[PDB]
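Sugar ABC transporter, periplasmic sugar-binding protein: structure, please.
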Amino acid sequence: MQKTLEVWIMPNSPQPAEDFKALVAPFEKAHGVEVKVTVLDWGVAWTKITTAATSGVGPDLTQLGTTWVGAISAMGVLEPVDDVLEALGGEKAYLPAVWRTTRLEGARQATAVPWFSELRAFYYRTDALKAAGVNPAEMFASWQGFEAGLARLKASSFRDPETKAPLAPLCTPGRTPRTLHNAAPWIWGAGGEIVRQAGGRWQSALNSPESLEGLYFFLSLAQKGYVPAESLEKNTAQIEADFQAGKCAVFASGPWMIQRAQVPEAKGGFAERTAAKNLGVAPYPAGPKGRYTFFGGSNLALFNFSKNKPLAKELLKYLGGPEAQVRYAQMTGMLPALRSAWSDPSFQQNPLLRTFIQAAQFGRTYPSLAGWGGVENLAVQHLGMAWDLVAQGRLTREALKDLMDKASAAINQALRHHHH
Ligand SMILES: OC[C@H]1O[C@@H](O[C@@H]2[C@@H](O)[C@H](O)O[C@H](CO)[C@H]2O)[C@H](O)[C@@H](O)[C@@H]1O
Ligand SMILES: [Cl-]
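Here you go.
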């Protein structure tokens, strides 16, 4: 009789269950096991996972967002996977920002195996920068170059061949629960942080001088006319759609847009569009205190009530390992989490994907706190109010400071009270 393993995943790929079943079919055959997959919507998965964790009933493996690893690990419900990670090549096999997501911050044992990385870089219209007299090498080198490039893009008379209208210089979604990930590289490039250990415990640093310098630099680009009114009312998918449709000269996204530019609109791509034929990528520009690439993605964890921890760890080694890494990155439009897979020809032969791997060298993640969930909720609430002021042209350094002072009080309260 076939042995059984159960895995919970989120919708990472176009046919989530079918793709995952294709991914693991070789493992199934090699180990005489049927891997049962259950797909959870991103918005319901956290509660289903915490219900599994406290009830002691659930799958053998679950996908976790990198930002969830601290909270679940602090519940004491995850099997240590230092063995699996040593098998896959240890600390040196991962970018440091990815390695940080294998455990609760400061914890003795690893509780999650890196599966795939989300990262962000700037897509840009090669045609629009040429017409505006902007060298992408200079525009994406520094904050000064970035803003000077947007000023040249705003002044340009260039029109999209299909829309027959001007392009907005920069699009950024102002209506998203993931708004903190778009702010994070500006906070970081100014020498700031969302949280910092201050007198030995974690506190908000959103109201630090450096955090406020970075956030004002980014949010003030909208107030200067570089981001349209309508973008601040849109979500991540709607901004991708606006770039595909020729409305934006520059926007931040992940690697999946490259594949989408190769596929016809009938298959959900944008190969027919001017943007697909005039596509550039550059990493985030260097701020005054450094250059940082937002990293996220997903890991896999083993529940300590699993009835077959040895076979589950063979599946973690398979999913974390070279061949499965490349294949699942292709399926999902993400990067491999395993650093050795960044040298696969399927990343090396495409110049746009080579640029993503250059951006990956600056990768940075949030601290893996047990309380991260509450921190991010509160940060997003107050960043939402800051974007609201941007819409009215009423974001001053003082109004931003007042909002991040409110966020910091609330975050510090949440961090003190986190239940164990
Ligand atoms: O906040 C949970 C996790 O969110 C992950 O991002 C997901 C995107 O990659 C996917 O495209 O959309 C879903 C639905 O909005 C996102 O949740 C991040 O990659 C993780 O780092 C994060 O823990
Ligand atoms: Cl941070």
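Notes: The chain has two domains: 1-119+294-368, 120-293+369-420.
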